[PDB]
């Protein structure tokens, strides 16, 4: 004899999709609104379990992308719209104490603004980077995003420093983390562990170099949905970090302008001191060692005796051609041609000249710009280049060389390097099984 028997609480899960809330231990990302995470995180190791993970078909990355976009929009909503700034500027070239690397990069633009009184004007000057002004045909210039989008001043109290956030699944759901240290990103994972929250992912915004990310453990990892495919970005995760030192040597002064009742526009006053180009430093020996390690783990998919070449970005906007990031409140676009200028066959610091943009078209959305307010003083930054976003050049000629060039732009690839090991599953605690019992 044998009959059904129902068990409640059995460890059975199915892959599913749900809303993952935030837990943390002002800011653009509402860290304060997040629930307080437990001081001692709980993680249960699972024995003799195999689950098929897929970093590229993951859904948590899409939710994180939507969440970051929503947080950006909700932080830029209650602050100053700069529509009066879209006016004909009369600009010259700044030449007082400028080096050879910044010849004409900054413009001294004088223009008329509305004052707090509606019927009175105001002739006020400011300093605009060459990338934020386009000529109209001293000369006449206008802000670059005045014929495509409306600018909203990044409102000076909010901070852009990425505070780590933990993505916690609701009750009735769990998150399987793939603890396998040789997990390439797509396939079965012998070592699965159940958790409730993620490991404090930093919403770092960068394009060519993954900054302040989570490192691998065993060796440098090469992840791609299809290495053979050339339309798929190759994520590279370093086992040891490469320190990058970022700096904006200019000593900027912020100047407040009354463009209306209560509304204030923060312009760049005269730079006190010497004007020097913003730049990045990366250890040459460390970078060469890391590139060699990457090539060593990159020849596996292409075989031995192949030539691995790193060249700079092949084209596109300033976001994809240059390593773009944000720190100290300022947005840097660094020409990483020195980094990827190498060929590999089977104390010195590389200096990357960076440019600064204030009219920021974040999240590649045409119709919503953002003016980053000037940051007082001199900005210095120290970051970890945790990973790379490479792209393989297509075609196949007689030569067997492969050229990998930095990519990016799509922040989904940036946030997929932190949610690769994580998967969200829905528990099914009801289960039927045979047993020899009956109700009396």
């Amino acid at each position, epitope marked *: 004899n044998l009959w059904v028997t129902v068990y409640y609480g059995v460890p059975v899960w199915k892959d599913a999709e749900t809303t993952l809330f935030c837990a943390s231990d002002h800011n653009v990302w509402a860290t304060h609104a997040c629930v307080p995470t437990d001081p001692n995180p709980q993680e249960i190791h699972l024995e003799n379990v195999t689950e098929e993970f897929n970093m590229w078909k993951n859904n948590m990355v899409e939710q994180m992308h939507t969440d970051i976009i929503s947080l950006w929009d909700q932080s830029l909503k209650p602050c100053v719209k700069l529509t009066p700034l879209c006016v004909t500027l009369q600009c010259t070239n700044v030449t007082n104490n400028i080096t050879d690397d910044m010849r004409g990069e900054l413009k001294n633009c004088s223009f008329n603004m509305t004052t707090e009184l509606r019927d009175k004007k105001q002739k006020v000057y400011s300093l605009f980077y060459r990338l934020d002004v386009v000529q109209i045909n001293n000369k006449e210039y206008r802000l670059i995003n005045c014929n495509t989008s409306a600018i909203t001043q990044a409102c000076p109290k909010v901070s852009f420093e990425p505070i780590p956030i933990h993505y916690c699944a609701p009750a009735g759901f769990a998150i399987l983390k793939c603890k396998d240290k040789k997990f390439n990103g797509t396939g079965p994972c012998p070592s699965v562990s159940t958790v409730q929250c993620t490991h404090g992912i930093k919403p770092v915004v960068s394009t060519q170099l993954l900054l302040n990310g989570s490192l691998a453990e065993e060796e440098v990892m090469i992840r791609s949905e299809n290495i053979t495919n050339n339309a798929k970005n190759i994520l590279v995760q370093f086992n040891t970090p490469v320190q990058i030192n970022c700096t904006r040597p200019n000593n900027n002064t912020r100047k407040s302008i009354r463009i209306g009742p209560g509304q204030a526009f923060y312009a760049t006053g005269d730079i006190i001191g010497d004007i020097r180009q913003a730049h990045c430093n990366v250890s040459k020996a460390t970078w060469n060692e890391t590139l060699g390690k990457v090539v060593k783990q990159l020849r596996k998919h292409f075989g031995n005796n192949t030539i691995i070449r790193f060249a700079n970005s092949s*084209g*596109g906007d300033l976001e994809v051609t240059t390593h773009s990031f944000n720190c100290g409140g300022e947005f840097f676009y660094c020409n990483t041609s020195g980094l990827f200028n190498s060929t590999w066959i089977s104390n010195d610091s590389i200096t990357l000249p960076c440019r600064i943009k204030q009219i920021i078209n974040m999240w590649q959305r045409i119709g919503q710009a953002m003016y980053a307010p000037p940051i007082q003083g001199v900005i210095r930054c120290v970051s970890n280049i945790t990973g790379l976003i490479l792209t393989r050049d*297509g*075609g196949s000629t007689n030569s067997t060389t492969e050229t990998f060039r930095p990519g990016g732009g799509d922040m989904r690839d940036n946030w997929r390097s932190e949610l690769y090991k994580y998967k969200v599953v829905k528990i099914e605690p009801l289960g039927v099984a045979p047993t020899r019992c009956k109700r009396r």
Partner: antibody
Amino acid sequence: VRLMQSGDEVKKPGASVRLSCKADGYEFSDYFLHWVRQAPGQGLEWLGFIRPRLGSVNYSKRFQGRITMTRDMSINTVYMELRSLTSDDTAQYYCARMYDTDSYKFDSWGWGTVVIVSS
Amino acid sequence: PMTQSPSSLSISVGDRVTITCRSSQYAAHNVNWYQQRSGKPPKLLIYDTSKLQAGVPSRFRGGGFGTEFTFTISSLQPEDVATYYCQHYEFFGQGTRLEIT
């Protein structure tokens, strides 16, 4: 989904030809655009692709350096410029739209633009 | 790269045809077949070697998973005279020309 190309062109050797490709009927941000050239009486050959979203490009190793692809979202066009033209570049150039990044799926093709390079 | 064979073949109307697509690298199922009519731009028929693009009649079918792929059209028709192209990612293949006997 319609991809209208540009007009048949004749260039002298050593000059640069800029073809265009206007795309309409679909959101010009989600689908990558490839340029596939075909010599007379020869098989299809891939030149390179461009992502209209941010202008990211990827050129074939055979045409690298001689080719440059740009996009213009306002007029909704993708342009491809070929430099240092030589005799064997006489071909018909098509602009295809890839549906999914995996399983390259050139759904819609342009009418084609024959570039004739001759003296 | 592809090694699509044969270069051409003469086939009577209604006869079954086969087009081998012997590849040189692991292509899995990401191989598509294009039909280019004489002069007209190429048109896609089969993607992923099994699925059929909408608007294509069901006589076309594909097969293969490894380095070998097959393309069949079952009942040939007068409007099926064209060139047929393999396509794995970037690389296309040498075309197969159909000629009515």
